[PDB]
Amino acid sequence: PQITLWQRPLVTIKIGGQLKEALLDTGADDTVLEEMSLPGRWKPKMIGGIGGFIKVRQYDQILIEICGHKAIGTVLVGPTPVNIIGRNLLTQIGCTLNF
Amino acid sequence: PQITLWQRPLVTIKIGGQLKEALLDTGADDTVLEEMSLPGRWKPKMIGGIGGFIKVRQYDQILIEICGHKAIGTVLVGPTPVNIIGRNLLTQIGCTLNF
Numbered sequence: 001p002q003i004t005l006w007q008r009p010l011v012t013i014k015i016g017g018q019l020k021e022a023l024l025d026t027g028a029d030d031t032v033l034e035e036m037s038l039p040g041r042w043k044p045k046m047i048g049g050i051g052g053f054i055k056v057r058q059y060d061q062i063l064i065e066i067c068g069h070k071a072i073g074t075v076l077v078g079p080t081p082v083n084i085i086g087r088n089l090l091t092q093i094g095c096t097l098n099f
Numbered sequence: 100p101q102i103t104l105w106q107r108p109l110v111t112i113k114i115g116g117q118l119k120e121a122l123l124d125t126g127a128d129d130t131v132l133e134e135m136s137l138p139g140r141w142k143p144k145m146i147g148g149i150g151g152f153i154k155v156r157q158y159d160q161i162l163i164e165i166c167g168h169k170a171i172g173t174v175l176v177g178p179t180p181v182n183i184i185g186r187n188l189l190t191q192i193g194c195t196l197n198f
């Protein structure tokens with residue numbers, strides 16, 4: 001797909017059999033999802049955004065289908081404004097910027 | 100050009116004679132730059148993100164040169180850790196997300 005940026009790039013993702021809206025964020029290194037229950041253990045992470053740092057929990061090897069494209073990688077759960085898809089998953093689905 | 104997301108999408112921009120390094124961010128609605136002097140009148144704005152809100156100065160109708168391409172728009176100047184080129188100017192250079 002080709003997505004223009006006139007509007008906010010919100011796509012539908014499927015995680016844990018659920019559907020959610022997520023932001024295709026190229027300026028985000030990591031994928032950060034809203035507070036939810038993921039399986040397995042979690043390690044601690046401190047990520048910094050525009051207003052400083054927050055603490056998140058990292059889950060490894062989570063299957064997440066972004067627009068009919070499967071991806072298995074690291075997902076961070078924490079107090080984020082919206083669900084964010086970062087470069088770690090954007091590269092898995094073959095996402096690039098063109099101009 | 101086609102920019103892959105293995106690395107951070109950084110590019111050189113020219114604003115007011117100064118050449119700066121900026122990150123192409125599809126997750127950002129606005130364009131925010133590190134503290135600097137821009138001519139004209141400004142308006143205090145409060146923008147939020149991961150970590151919270153920061154107070155920025157809003158300058159309208161500012162010209163920026165993103166990889167040779169010129170773009171005219173509103174740029175916020177404040178205490179940001181990275182120079183962000185948001186959707187408002189991304190659309191101007193015909194920036195698109197493909198996968």
Ligand SMILES: C[C@H]1CC[C@@H](O)[C@H]1NC(=O)[C@H](Cc1ccccc1)C[C@H](O)CN1CCN(C(=O)CCc2cccnc2)C[C@H]1C(=O)NC(C)(C)C
Binds near residue numbers: 027032050130147149
């Ligand atoms: C994702 C993190 C993981 C690790 C870092 O990679 C990190 N990246 C980022 O945070 C980068 C900046 C950065 C990159 C590299 C080094 C340091 C900092 C910004 C992010 O891509 C854009 N971001 C998405 C979430 N946002 C929203 O949903 C807004 C919703 C909303 C609701 C109500 C009121 N206001 C806003 C805020 C928005 C943002 O920042 N927008 C502005 C205008 C402020 C720039």
